[PDB]
Amino acid sequence: NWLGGLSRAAFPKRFVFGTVTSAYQVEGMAASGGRGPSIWDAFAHTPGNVAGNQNGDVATDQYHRYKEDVNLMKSLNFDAYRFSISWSRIFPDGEGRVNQEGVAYYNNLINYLLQKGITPYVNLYHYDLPLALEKKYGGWLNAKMADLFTEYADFCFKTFGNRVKHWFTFNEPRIVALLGYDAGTNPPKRCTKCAAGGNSATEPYIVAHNFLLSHAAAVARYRTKYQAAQQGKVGIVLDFNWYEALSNSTEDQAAAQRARDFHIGWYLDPLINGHYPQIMQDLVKDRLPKFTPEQARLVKGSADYIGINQYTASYMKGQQLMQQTPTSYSADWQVTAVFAKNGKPIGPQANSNWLYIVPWGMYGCVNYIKQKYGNPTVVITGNGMDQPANLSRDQYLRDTTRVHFYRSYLTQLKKAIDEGANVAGYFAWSLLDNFEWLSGYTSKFGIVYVDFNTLERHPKASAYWFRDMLKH
Ligand SMILES: OC[C@H]1O[C@@H](O[C@H]2[C@H](O)[C@@H](O)[C@H](O[C@H]3[C@H](O)[C@@H](O)[C@H](O[C@H]4[C@H](O)[C@@H](O)[C@H](O)O[C@@H]4CO)O[C@@H]3CO)O[C@@H]2CO)[C@H](O)[C@@H](O)[C@@H]1O
Numbered sequence: 001n002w003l004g005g006l007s008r009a010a011f012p013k014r015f016v017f018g019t020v021t022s023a024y025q026v027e028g029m030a031a032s033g034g035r036g037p038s039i040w041d042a043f044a045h046t047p048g049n050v051a052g053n054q055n056g057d058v059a060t061d062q063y064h065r066y067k068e069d070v071n072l073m074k075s076l077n078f079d080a081y082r083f084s085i086s087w088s089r090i091f092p093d094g095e096g097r098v099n100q101e102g103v104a105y106y107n108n109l110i111n112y113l114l115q116k117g118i119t120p121y122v123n124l125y126h127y128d129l130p131l132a133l134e135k136k137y138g139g140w141l142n143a144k145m146a147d148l149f150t151e152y153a154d155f156c157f158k159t160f161g162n163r164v165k166h167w168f169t170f171n172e173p174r175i176v177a178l179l180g181y182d183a184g185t186n187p188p189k190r191c192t193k194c195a196a197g198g199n200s201a202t203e204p205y206i207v208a209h210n211f212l213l214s215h216a217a218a219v220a221r222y223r224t225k226y227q228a229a230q231q232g233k234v235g236i237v238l239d240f241n242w243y244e245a246l247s248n249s250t251e252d253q254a255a256a257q258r259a260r261d262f263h264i265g266w267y268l269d270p271l272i273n274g275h276y277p278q279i280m281q282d283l284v285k286d287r288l289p290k291f292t293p294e295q296a297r298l299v300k301g302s303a304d305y306i307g308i309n310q311y312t313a314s315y316m317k318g319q320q321l322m323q324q325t326p327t328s329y330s331a332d333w334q335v336t337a338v339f340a341k342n343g344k345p346i347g348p349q350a351n352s353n354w355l356y357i358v359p360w361g362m363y364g365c366v367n368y369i370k371q372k373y374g375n376p377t378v379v380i381t382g383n384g385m386d387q388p389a390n391l392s393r394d395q396y397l398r399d400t401t402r403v404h405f406y407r408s409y410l411t412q413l414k415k416a417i418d419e420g421a422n423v424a425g426y427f428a429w430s431l432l433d434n435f436e437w438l439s440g441y442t443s444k445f446g447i448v449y450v451d452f453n454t455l456e457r458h459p460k461a462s463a464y465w466f467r468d469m470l471k472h
């Protein structure tokens with residue numbers, strides 16, 4: 001059957017199914033309703049930065065159309081909606097004055113979701129640092145971010161936490177560190193060679209450390225001030241793509257494990273065990289910041305659940321570990337990514353070149369977290385694939401590749417859960433075609449088609465696949 005035996009009965013009792021967006025990618029009204037600019041507004045308005053010089057000024061205009069979009073998700077039988085609050089829509093300068101019109105928007109959204117029986121899962125941060133904070137403080141390079149983020153988080157807990165019971169602090173701090181401070185291809189565009197300055201060998205580590213410390217500080221504030229009354233939870237969202245040893249050799253097996261440690265262990269070892277992975281300590285040395293005992297104790301156990309964004313997988317080939325002049329976080333791993341084994345590609349690619357369709361990667365990742373980290377509560381916070389630009393409306397709607405993607409990936413997730421993985425929920429990226437960062441509107445991840453000329457929504461075949469799979 002097109003559901004392939006999947007339904008709510010195939011997953012644990014009370015398992016949560018939702019869709020996910022982020023503020024800058026869907027809201028629009030980027031310079032309206034009192035919102036201050038984010039680093040992404042400045043970046044996207046710079047000629048050459050985004051495909052077609054596009055930006056999120058209008059995006060999907062969810063700001064005006066949110067009731068349509070909530071009605072749609074309810075009609076598709078989802079239980080939950082993961083979205084983010086734009087920091088600069090609440091605090092246009094990142095600190096100080098509150099934008100009441102911004103607060104009203106999120107109140108209206110949260111209330112409508114609850115009216116329609118959809119549980120809000122709310123991210124505080126999704127790449128969209130207030131521009132004012134980047135300029136005044138130097139953003140995530142500055143340890144003062146812990147204080148600034150905590151004050152913002154405190155405001156959100158106070159204002160929305162009587163209703164919102166499932167929070168996430170950050171979305172994929174690894175991607176911020178990698179693209180913003182190693183490769184320098186995302187804001188603030190820092191890297192060793194970059195015009196804005198930087199150092200690809202040091203700054204990604206500083207940035208990651210500050211995300212961990214900021215997460216821990218915000219969670220300590222939630223736990224000491226709000227949790228008794230509100231009785232909600234706070235986690236973090238981490239990207240994790242699967243790495244499989246290219247062969248059963250010692251060097252290849254070591255390579256795959258080293259890659260896992262630099263990718264996900266970078267954050268999970270601090271969050272679960274209170275230290276960075278040993279291999280990062282051994283290889284990165286003085287360039288890896290050291291947690292004080294007090295900080296490690298604040299960071300350890302500071303996530304109520306681990307959000308995982310899971311998309312893809314690759315093979316890893318190793319070599320002899322060697323002494324080398326530091327150049328970048330990326331080069332520090334001393335591995336080679338490989339996308340074919342025994343002459344056959346690991347999987348076909350979706351529209352994004354990095355996204356190889358490999359359903360067994362989902363099992364790989366979930367099983368690995370279960371076995372390595374004491375089976376913490378995991379939520380799959382994003383999973384999906386993209387269509388290319390320039391298709392007809394009907395071609396977008398007939399998304400048979402995406403239907404196959406979800407059926408296969410969800411079957412692999414079911415396999416891991418049936419083997420005992422503590423997975424509490426799953427969220428499809430995305431509800432809607434949206435602004436896909438550097439790809440702008442050239443990459444379509446939605447289960448619902450958005451016509452970017454008229455802004456009309458049209459559910460794709462994959463949306464009706466979910467509706468059928470999720471009927472109560
Ligand atoms: O309906 C509005 C909209 O829907 C869009 O999507 C369609 C799909 O294109 C179409 O293939 C799909 O058909 C499903 C059907 O809904 C299921 O009920 C059926 O499931 C069977 C299964 O085949 C058996 O093996 C199993 O044992 O029993 C079940 C249930 O009895 O499977 C077929 C797929 O072959 O339905 C979607 C939603 O209607 C259309 O693309 C669009 O044109 C429509 O406007």
Ligand SMILES: OC[C@H]1O[C@@H](O[C@H]2[C@H](O)[C@@H](O)[C@H](O[C@H]3[C@H](O)[C@@H](O)[C@H](O[C@H]4[C@H](O)[C@@H](O)[C@H](O)O[C@@H]4CO)O[C@@H]3CO)O[C@@H]2CO)[C@H](O)[C@@H](O)[C@@H]1O
Nearest residue numbers: 022171172175179183239241309311354382429436437445
């Ligand atoms: O994208 C959909 C949606 O989900 C989330 O998107 C994240 C993904 O979770 C994350 O895995 C993805 O990471 C990509 C990254 O964008 C690429 O730039 C990077 O490219 C590599 C390249 O493949 C290598 O050949 C080269 O050596 O290095 C570069 C890195 O400089 O590859 C990774 C995957 O391995 O990033 C997505 C966001 O950009 C987000 O939560 C959501 O907002 C997205 O819309």
Ligand SMILES: [Zn+2]
Nearest residue numbers: 061063064065
């Ligand atoms: Zn509008």
